[PDB]
Each structure stands twice: as C-alpha cells, then as structure tokens.
Amino acid sequence: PNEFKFMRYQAVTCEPNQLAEKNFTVRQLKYLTPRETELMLVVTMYNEDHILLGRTLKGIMDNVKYMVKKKNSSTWGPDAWKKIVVCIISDGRSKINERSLALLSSLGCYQDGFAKDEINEKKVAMHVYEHTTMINITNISESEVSLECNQGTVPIQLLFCLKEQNQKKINSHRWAFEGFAELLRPNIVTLLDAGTMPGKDSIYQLWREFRNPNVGGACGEIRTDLGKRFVKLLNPLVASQNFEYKMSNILDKTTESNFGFITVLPGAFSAYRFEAVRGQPLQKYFYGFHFFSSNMYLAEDRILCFEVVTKKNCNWILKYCRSSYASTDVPERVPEFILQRRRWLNGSFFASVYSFCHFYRVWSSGHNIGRKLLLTVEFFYLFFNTLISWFSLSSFFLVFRILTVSIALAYHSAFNVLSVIFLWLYGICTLSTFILSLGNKPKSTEKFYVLTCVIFAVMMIYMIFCSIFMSVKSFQNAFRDIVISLGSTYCLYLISSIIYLQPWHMLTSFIQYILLSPSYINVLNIYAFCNVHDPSYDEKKTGYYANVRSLVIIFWVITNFIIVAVVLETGGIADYIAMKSISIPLMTSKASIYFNVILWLVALSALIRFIGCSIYMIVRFFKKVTF
Amino acid sequence: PNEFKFMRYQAVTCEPNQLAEKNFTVRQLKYLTPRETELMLVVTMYNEDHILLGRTLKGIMDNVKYMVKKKNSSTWGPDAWKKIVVCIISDGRSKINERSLALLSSLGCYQDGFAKDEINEKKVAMHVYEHTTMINITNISESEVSLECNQGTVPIQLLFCLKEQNQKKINSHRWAFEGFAELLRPNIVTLLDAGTMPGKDSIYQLWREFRNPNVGGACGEIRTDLGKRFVKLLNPLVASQNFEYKMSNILDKTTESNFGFITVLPGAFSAYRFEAVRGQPLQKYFYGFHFFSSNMYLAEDRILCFEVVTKKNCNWILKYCRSSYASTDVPERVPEFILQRRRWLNGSFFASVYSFCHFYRVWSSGHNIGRKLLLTVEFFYLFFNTLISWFSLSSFFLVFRILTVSIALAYHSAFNVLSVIFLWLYGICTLSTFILSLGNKPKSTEKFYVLTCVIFAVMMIYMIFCSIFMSVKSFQNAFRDIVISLGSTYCLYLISSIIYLQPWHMLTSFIQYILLSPSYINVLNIYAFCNVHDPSYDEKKTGYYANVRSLVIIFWVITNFIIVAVVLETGGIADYIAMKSISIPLMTSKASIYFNVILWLVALSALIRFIGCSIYMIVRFFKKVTF
Numbered sequence A, B: 001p002n003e004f005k006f007m008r009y010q011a012v013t014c015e016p017n018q019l020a021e022k023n024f025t026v027r028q029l030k031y032l033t034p035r036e037t038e039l040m041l042v043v044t045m046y047n048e049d050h051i052l053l054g055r056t057l058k059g060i061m062d063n064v065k066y067m068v069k070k071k072n073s074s075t076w077g078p079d080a081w082k083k084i085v086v087c088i089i090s091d092g093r094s095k096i097n098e099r100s101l102a103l104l105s106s107l108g109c110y111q112d113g114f115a116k117d118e119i120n121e122k123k124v125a126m127h128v129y130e131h132t133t134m135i136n137i138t139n140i141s142e143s144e145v146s147l148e149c150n151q152g153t154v155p156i157q158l159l160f161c162l163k164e165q166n167q168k169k170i171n172s173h174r175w176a177f178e179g180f181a182e183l184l185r186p187n188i189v190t191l192l193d194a195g196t197m198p199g200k201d202s203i204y205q206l207w208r209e210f211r212n213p214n215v216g217g218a219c220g221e222i223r224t225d226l227g228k229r230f231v232k233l234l235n236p237l238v239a240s241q242n243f244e245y246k247m248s249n250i251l252d253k254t255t256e257s258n259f260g261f262i263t264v265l266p267g268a269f270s271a272y273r274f275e276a277v278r279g280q281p282l283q284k285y286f287y288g289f290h291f292f293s294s295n296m297y298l299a300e301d302r303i304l305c306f307e308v309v310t311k312k313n314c315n316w317i318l319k320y321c322r323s324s325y326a327s328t329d330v331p332e333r334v335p336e337f338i339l340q341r342r343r344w345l346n347g348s349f350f351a352s353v354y355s356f357c358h359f360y361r362v363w364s365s366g367h368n369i370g371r372k373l374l375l376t377v378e379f380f381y382l383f384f385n386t387l388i389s390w391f392s393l394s395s396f397f398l399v400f401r402i403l404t405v406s407i408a409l410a411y412h413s414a415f416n417v418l419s420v421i422f423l424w425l426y427g428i429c430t431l432s433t434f435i436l437s438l439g440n441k442p443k444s445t446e447k448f449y450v451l452t453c454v455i456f457a458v459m460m461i462y463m464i465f466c467s468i469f470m471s472v473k474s475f476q477n478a479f480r481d482i483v484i485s486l487g488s489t490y491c492l493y494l495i496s497s498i499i500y501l502q503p504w505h506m507l508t509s510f511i512q513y514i515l516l517s518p519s520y521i522n523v524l525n526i527y528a529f530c531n532v533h534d535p536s537y538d539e540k541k542t543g544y545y546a547n548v549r550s551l552v553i554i555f556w557v558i559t560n561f562i563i564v565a566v567v568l569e570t571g572g573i574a575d576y577i578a579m580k581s582i583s584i585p586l587m588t589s590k591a592s593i594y595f596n597v598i599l600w601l602v603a604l605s606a607l608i609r610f611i612g613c614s615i616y617m618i619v620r621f622f623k624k625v626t627f
C-alpha cells in the first residue's frame, strides 16, 4: 500500500520522555484499527559498515519469515508481520557511515534532502524515517549484499531513527524505551547490537520463553563468528575469546538462571517484558557527590537486571534460554581488545558491589520465601566470585613464585637462574603495564603489549612444565593434591561441555585460552582499574573521579600485597621473625598450605558451576519431555 | 617634552623577527640625533597584581636614580637616563590583571580605547604603549602604592608591550630579542621577572662586570623575601627554600663561575651582552622526531648558556657577580610549590644531558687551551652531579633501610617493629606519590601531600635519632666514619657561609631544610619525572611525548632498583646465592661498604664546592684590592 510505497519522515524536537504529550504519532497508531504490536527490535549502530548491519538485518528478516511461516500458533500466522516493528537507532549524522546509508536507502529506508537542521528556530533533536519494506536480502558476500524482491520475501515494518550528535548509548536506549515503547506499548522489546546475526530461529526460541508470566528478562547464547571455514580460529586471540564465551555461556548462565538472577544480559542480544521494566527500572537506569549515586553509570545495563528482580510487591525473574543464540565478532588486535574488556571489568565490578550492598532490597519484593532465600544465596555466591576475582593478581603471582622456587630448590640443576630470570621478567612486565596503562594509551604502543602477552605466555608454559615435572618425579618416587585438583577441574569442564552438547570448543580452542590466562589476570585487570572513569562543576566532577580512581588502585594493590607479605613473608615480616628469635628461612609451611588452598578453591568453584549446569539442563529436558 | 607629556601607541602585526624590514620604528630612533641606548630591561608579567609589579618597578627606578646620581663615571652622569629603556612585555589582554593596569595607567603608561583588535582586515599581533615618565613611586604599602612627582624623581623611558593571547614565555623573549633589541641595538639587555625587586644598587653592580670584554652573560644572587620582620620564616616551607637558595648561590654559583660556565642564569635576574648572543644562540633558543631536537624546549633558558660558552671562534664566558642581588617570593603551599619544581628538575636534567652529549663542541670555539681544559673538567663534574642526583631515590631509601635494620638488630629492644612500621610507611608513601602524580594533579589533593611531607619528616627525625644513638653507644664502647663525614660536611657548610659573610641562614632556617630533604628526594623527583612533557600531527607529537615520558620513568625506576638489589640482595639474588651454596643471611659486608661510600662521596662533594667558593671569593678580594 501507500505506506509500503512511500517512506514518511518526521523531525523529533523534545526530551525523549515527552513524546506522548508532545503530540507525536506513529503509523502503527494511525491505521483505522490500531495495530497491536507484540514485539519491538532495537538495533544500535554507531559507525558500522554496511556488511555488519546486513548480517544483523538478514538474521532479523529470516527470523520474521520463520514466524510468519508458523501454522499452529495463536500468536502468529500469515499476517504475523503486522505485529512486529524494527527500530534502528543510529547516533549522529556525522559519524554514521554513509557506506551503510547506501544499503539503507537501497531498502527505501532513507531518502536525503528533507532534513532542515532546525525548524521554526527549533533544532530537530533527531530525524525519523517510516517505511514498511517488501524486498529482502538473500545473500551477503564478503563485499556485496544481494537484495531481491520476490513472492517469497516478507514485509518488515522498519523505523529508522537518526540522532545528530555523539550520545553515549545510555541516551539511545532512552529514546527506545521512554519514547517509542511508551507509544506502541509492545509486550516484548528485544535489544541487539549491529553486526550481531541472530540465529535463524533464535528469535522465536527466545520469544517462546515469555509464555511464562513471571519472566521479565531473558537472553541467549553468544557465539564468536568464525567466518569462512573457521579460518579465524588459527588466530590465538579470536580463538581464546571463543573459548571464553563458550565456557561462560555453558556454566555461568545456566547456574545463575537456575536461581533466577542473571548478572549481565548480553547487550549483544537480550529481551525484556516491557510492562515489568516500566517505572522504577528505567528511572534508576537513566537518572541515577556520593559514591553509588554518582558512579552507577559504569554498570549501565546490569542495574536494570538487579532492580527487575528486586521490584517491590513484584516477582519478576530472569531466564537464560539455551535454545536461542546470536553470532558476533570479537576484536583481533590486542589494543582494541583491551579497550573493550576495560569496559566489562568495571561494569561487572560496580554492579557486583552495588547489588551486594543493596541485597536487603530483595526481601521487600513480592517473591515467595523459598525464591527469596535462593536469590540471597545466589547473591552471596556472586559476591564471593567478585572477592576472588579481586585477589586475582596476588594469587597468580604467588602460585607462580612458590612453584618456581620449590622446583629449583628441589633439583638445583638449572631451574635456578630460571627462577631469578622469570621473577625479573614478571616484575618488569607488571611495572611497565602499570605505567603504560596509567599514562599512555593502548593504541599508541601496540608492539609492547603484544610482547607483554607473549612473555606472560612463555611464563605459563614454564609454570606448566615445572608442574608436570614435579608431578612426574613425585609419582615415580601437596603435589598429588595439585594433580588431583587440576585433573578434576579439566574433567569437569569436559563433561559439562559434552552435556551441553557443544564439545567442539574443548579441544579446538583450549590451548589459546590457557596460554592467554596470564594476560587475562595481569593486563586486563591492570588496565581496567587504571582507567576506571576515563571552578566549574565539570572540573569538580573530574576531581572527584580522579579521587575515586586513584583510591581504588591503591586499595587493590596494597591489599594484594598484604596477602603476598603474609604468605611469602615479604615486607620484612620474615626479618622481624628472625630478629624476634634473636632477642631467615627460605620457605615455610605457609606456602604449602596456601598453595593447596588456591587449587582446592578452584576445584570447588568448577564443581559448583558444574552442578548448576546439570540442574538447568535436566529441568529443561524434563519440561520438554512433558511438553 | 611632548613625548614626556603624551603616550604614543602603535599596533604591531608581523612575526617578531620581521620588525626591521616591516618598517616599524621607535621613538629612540626618531630623535634628531638617535639616542644610543646602553641598556634594556625586560619585565615579564603574566597575571601579577599591582603590588608585585610595584615592587619590581621600585627596584628599577631606585637603581636608575643611583646611576644618574653617579659623578665619576664615563658612561653615566646627569643625563644617564637617556641611555636606558625598560620594556614591559605582558602576555594576553584577557589574562592580565587590570588591578595592575590601574597602576600602569596611573603612570601614564597606558590609555584604553585606541585598540582595534584588527586593522585593514589584519589583526594586531600585539599593542605597544610609548612614554617617558617623570613621576616615581616612593613607598609600597601592603595594599597601597605611593606615587609622587617632585624635583627628586627621575625620568624613565618605558615601553609597554601587550600581546593578546597565551604565549609561553619563549615567545615573549623573542619579541624582546629578535624584535626591539634588533632595532635599538643596546649593548646590554637584562631580564627580570615581575615581582622581583632588584637591590637598590644591584643593577649598577651587575653592570660593572661588563667592563671585561669577554663577559657575555652574568647574574646575581636571589634572595627569598621575608616580608615584614621576617614574619615568613616561621613557616617551614618558605624557610626551607630560603636556605636552599642561599646554599645554592653561595656554593654552586661561585664554583661554576670559577671555571666560566654557569649552568642556569636565574630567569628572575640575569643579563646578556647583546652582541654575544646574536646569531646562533637565539636561533637554537627559538627554533630548536629525534630526541634532542624535539625535546630541548624543556631546557629553554639553559641552552643559551651552553651555546654562548661554546660559540665557534669566540671566547665568551659567564660570570656570577656576588655584589648584585634580587629579592623574590616563593610558594607557600605544597601544591603550587610542586608545580614549580616540576619545571626546574626537568629543565636542569635535559640541559645537563644535552650539554654533556655535545661537550666536544667546546674545543671548536675560540677559547684558549687552558680555558678549554677547565671547561671540560667543569662539564664532567657537572655531569657527575646529574648522575648522582639521578640515583637519589635508591640512595636515600638504601641508607634509611640499612641504618634502621642495623640499629634494631644491634639492640633488639623496640626498634624492631619500628623497622617494620617505617618500612611500610615508606612503601605506602612512595607508591601513593607515584599514582597521585601520574594520574591525579597536585592541587586536587593538597591534604595528602601535606601528610606525605610530614611522614617523610618524621622518618628523617627517626633516622637521625638512630644515627646519633649508635654514634653515642659506639663512642662509649663505619659509624666513627659517619660521624666524621657528617661533622665535616656541616662544618664545611658553616665555614663557607661565614666566608661569604651571610651566616644568618645557617642557624635560622636550617632545621626546616633538613627535615624537608626527604620530600626533596622522594616527592619532587617523582612528580618531576611523572610529568615530563605535560591522524593529525598534534596527536602524533602527543604519542611521541607519552612514549618518552613513560620510557624515562621505567629506566629510572629499574636502574635504581638494580642498585638496591645488588646491595641489599633483594630481587631473589640472595636466594640464588643460598641455593647456589645448596647445590639467607640478614645483612652482608656490602651494606657497610656502600653505606660508607655514600657519605664519603657526600663529604667529597661538599669539600670540592667549598674550594670553589674559597677561590672565587679570594680572586674577587684580590682584584678589589688592586682596584
């Protein structure tokens, strides 16, 4: 029809939560009978190329075609596309890649020219393009995208929003939620990220979850894309992230969704029951000097999670639906990789502290007593993992040093200068990582970071060689304990991956992750903390921000060293001991005890998350069997 | 006359070294017979209050009145003021304090209104006000300045330049030298700083030096002002800088001016024979990626020094005239104090490296062989002091630790937990100083720096207490050596100060300096190095700058630790030793040997500079006796 034959345009000019009273309308509401939309898809693209958006949008229409092809369903059928809308928010006309605009206009999504920057002495906060397309893309080559319109293609109700300035994504989502979502009032709103291709039936699988009324938030698995013929896995930096994604989705998502709280809905792919997130959630998500109030913006997405679980007089829960997945890409060079993880570490850490500091809010929600108890246990366990990850640094170095010294002492042959050399390499690498993080930037000095990761890698190889060497000699003759613990944790990893029915990561892309683990402990952490926050009031916030940043780093480093001093007897406590007896030995029983403790704890964590995986999978199997 | 009755104004609009061909003139050249100026005084003021400029300007006219009152002189007499000009360059109309403009216009130096920002579509690089005043100020109260015009006041040929923008002072001096000084061609140009009051006869004393033709550069003493009734000395931060100024001027100026090269002409008060500095000196001073070429701007003033000594086929020398002094003020709070010394440490360090790297240029100058040899020895000695100051940090901590441990070991009573506590305080203070320097700013966290200086102070008190305690017990029963060395260095300091005939600093303001010395080693250094330097080409320089900054800090810290490890046997070398014998002791003979070495060297340095002071004073006395 005409709306499918022409693309309407409009100029928004008001604060996002004002659209309703501002008398701004949309086509969905202007039909003779209003179209009751069931679902909204939000795509955020910043400067993405046409190919990336093409991947994501192909996933979109493939899903919608599948839903329209469904026969036995009350919600869907031949006209199912009517209840669907895809909102594409882009940030800033200047930064958006016209290379992508070519594809958009190729769809009839966009036409240029009718965009006066301001009207009636009033600038247009953002531009909006309204259309429902009938053409669909069928193939995406490495540089070419195939657009075809046949009797098999299906309609899509697009809605292209374009802001005109740099707004940190916290703004984009505002327009999505407090703006359009207030007008259309969809039941379900799903967030993607440009360049993330949903699975061909991922969307429907995820949607099926919201049959259960209590469900308020859900997500799916996230898979690193491997391109043509897995050609990317040969790189050790893409492969390592693949493995990490896969273990995270297998273990932590299932274990947490057992209880009901899922820590971070992947912003790559997530979905929210609109009614549940209305009111308090968006308010604390958008509007927040005191610590929590002025810092929570670094835990942007994960806050919503918390509050939706803890909503007063309300019993919303969160679920991880294993049957839906989205395939995305990961950085290839170390610099931008570090500039990525510097965001997740802080986000998770601040959400962790904030949640645990406000756990008592859970009991004042509407959940049942048993569910409330389970949530409390989950929060305590989660806080426990934050505590362990905070003592990552000292734990790693201490394990390293104790193992190295013990082997050289035990055999005296040549592991000796190896002990000293490796200690010095550790010191230089850690110190240099500090100063480069604090003063410099990652992208300026790529070559050194590449060297840093390599040095830590060979350190891990050496550690492993010593570990196996002592194990072998001892068995030929705590180390029986270490071989037990490591064999156990590896076996548990394997059996869990098999149960989940994706074991092809346990052997393909495992060694890369093991060799990168030191870089995940001593580089990502250091750079993460060193860039916490990245006269007039502005400088006053800046002074406060610097205060917090340079206070957290001090506490972190000092406390880790406290542990190192207590165990290794560094910091002159050992001297104080010897001279107290006067009124120093090499290593004490403390080293053996602590060394056992760290591996004991690691095996404990693996076992618990394994149980979580088993329970979640079993429950899904039983409900499927009954269904 | 009319020029004394009216103030002429003009709008400069050309690069500073273009004034001559640009057909821009000055009154001094427009008289029926050109006035052969003998001397130019340059005053730079940035945002100084009227009082500070009043102090400096009072010093100025008092000196000129004294010269005009001279009777037996070929150069001066009743009309001596004719050969004098005072150029007052201020930077930026926006930043200059109108509170000072009130005084300036009170003198008829400035009138507002005739200052079109641009003319003929050409902006005025800077504005210039020409006048010769007859009134003089007679008194400067704490808030009021007394301007009187009587038969005793004397004419002053002022010349008020005003730029319109932030230009780092390297620009101001350009206009002084390559601009006006090229027109007037004075014999002698003297640089002050606003707020620095020359001594009532300091200028004439300094001028008398340029009787000797070879002299190219000279300066005088710099005295911290003490205000009314020395009321400032009670503060321990003004007092400490007073003492440091006084020792520096007594020892280093005299010793260096013995040879001929004076490292840094105090920009507060200095004087240059114009002819000598023409050509190469200004060129390398103004116009300079490779290290030296792109970094020398941090040694701005001291470069000229070097080149003027090393000018090819020319035998210019530098002299320190003790008979001339200038009294200035010093910062009172720790923040701006640190932001001051962060400039001198880098300036001296870069000039030191640059000079010593180019010492071979001296022999290709015009000096005699004996003078060339003396200059070479002076350069080597100076480079030696840079080397010692670079190992300041490890030397201080190592002395501290060795002394503390030895005393607690020797007596076991309670110095024990004192050893551990103080070690921990040192670690925390140093680490925190690093991170606050690198990430934060001084002014943001004043309170912590005040705490830092205090903690280091009590550490020094403790060190001293242990030192005297061991000395006392040993004498009742290397430490005989330490008491010898410290008694020697203190005695040499005293005798030198007496010889110079200003001993009233040795007892008034000594304890403050001693207690602040740790802050001079572990805080000023750290912050100095951590702020070395403070797509498009601009970001490319920035990347290079960050590279150099974060490389120098690494080398400094690593090398200092190399020394600490070798001496104290830290870094596991001690472990390697014990386990080598296997195939650790507390302290070795290394500690005693090095401990003796540091004090031995300190006594050596004091003795040498003492000899320098004695020779300079003796030579001045003998020449005065003959004169």
Ligand SMILES: O=c1ccn([C@@H]2O[C@H](COP(=O)(O)OP(=O)(O)O)[C@@H](O)[C@H]2O)c(=O)[nH]1
Residues within 6 Å of the ligand: A044, A045, A046, A047, A091, A167, A168, A169, A193, A194, A267, A340, A343
């Ligand atoms: O100004 C911004 C910042 C972020 N993003 C979104 O966040 C991504 C950049 O972050 P990245 O993909 O590396 O990981 P994320 O930070 O989302 O975890 C972009 O591709 C967008 O999906 C955006 O669109 N605009």
Ligand SMILES: O=c1ccn([C@@H]2O[C@H](COP(=O)(O)OP(=O)(O)O)[C@@H](O)[C@H]2O)c(=O)[nH]1
Residues within 6 Å of the ligand: B044, B045, B046, B047, B091, B167, B168, B169, B193, B194, B267, B340, B343
């Ligand atoms: O933009 C500037 C920078 C510096 N100065 C001069 O340098 C002083 C500031 O430095 P300070 O006096 O603290 O010591 P200096 O840096 O000269 O050693 C000012 O008072 C001026 O004399 C100036 O006039 N303008």
Ligand SMILES: [Mg+2]
Residues within 6 Å of the ligand: A193, A195, A328, A329
């Ligand atoms: Mg991405």
Ligand SMILES: [Mg+2]
Residues within 6 Å of the ligand: A330, A331, A340
């Ligand atoms: Mg990315």
Ligand SMILES: [Mg+2]
Residues within 6 Å of the ligand: B193, B195, B328, B329
């Ligand atoms: Mg000053």
Ligand SMILES: [Mg+2]
Residues within 6 Å of the ligand: B330, B331, B340
């Ligand atoms: Mg100053």
